[PDB]
């Protein structure tokens, strides 16, 4: 087949959003659309680094 493995630490969703829930924001407002790709996982948050990781840390 041919299909691109994202890392682990991403997930492959047919919708998602170029703004995900982060440490700043837990739900920014955006005019986005559903966006085909690899995103963080359910549950894992930008932090206030500049990375995914569990909301814990925020």
């Not at 170029?18 to 659309?33: F, G, I, Q």
Request: contains cysteine; aromatic residues 6%; positive net charge.
């Amino acid at each position: 087949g041919s299909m691109i493995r994202c890392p682990k630490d991403k997930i492959y969703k047919f919708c998602g959003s170029p703004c995900p829930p982060s440490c700043k924001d837990l739900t920014p407002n955006c005019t986005r659309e559903c966006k085909k790709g690899c995103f963080c996982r359910d549950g894992t948050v930008d932090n206030n680094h500049g990375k995914c990781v569990k909301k814990e840390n925020c």
